[PDB]
Design a protein around this ligand. Sequence first.
Ligand SMILES: CCOc1ccccc1O
Length: 162
Amino acid sequence: MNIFEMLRIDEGLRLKIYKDTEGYYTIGIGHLLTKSPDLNAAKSELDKAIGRNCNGVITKDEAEKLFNQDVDAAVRGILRNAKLKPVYDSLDAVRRCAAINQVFQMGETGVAGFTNSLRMLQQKRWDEAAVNLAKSRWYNQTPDRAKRVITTFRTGTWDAYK
Ligand SMILES: CCOc1ccccc1O
């Protein structure tokens, strides 16, 4: 297991524009196109992202290209974030994957509501961290996925991803 395989499990792979769990137009491996309810705006974003007229459809290679960009951008974002970087840098590699996964899903803004969880993670109070993480819209809206990511934070193993 690694961050790619982990996020591939969590996000799936769809080659046509679809709506994510929040109802937002998305494609590939959880590549968010737009929060606009306007399908044409999503199609425009898609074309801009791929560099061709896609007509709402991409190939596996294109999906994986966006995915690489998105994962890298998530990591680079964490590193530029004065609140996230020290916590991220305190973690071992497996727990860092949980961190990237969470940021990938909810964005840096999405995190940030997680001040108390971040402090517990930096403290390596893993069970307490895991309890705090589950007290969230995140967990309640996507529990099966959040459970996996939380188990990864709690254990620093890939047990939840088999
Ligand atoms: C609670 C979210 O966990 C993290 C997210 C981003 C960077 C480091 C973290 O521990």
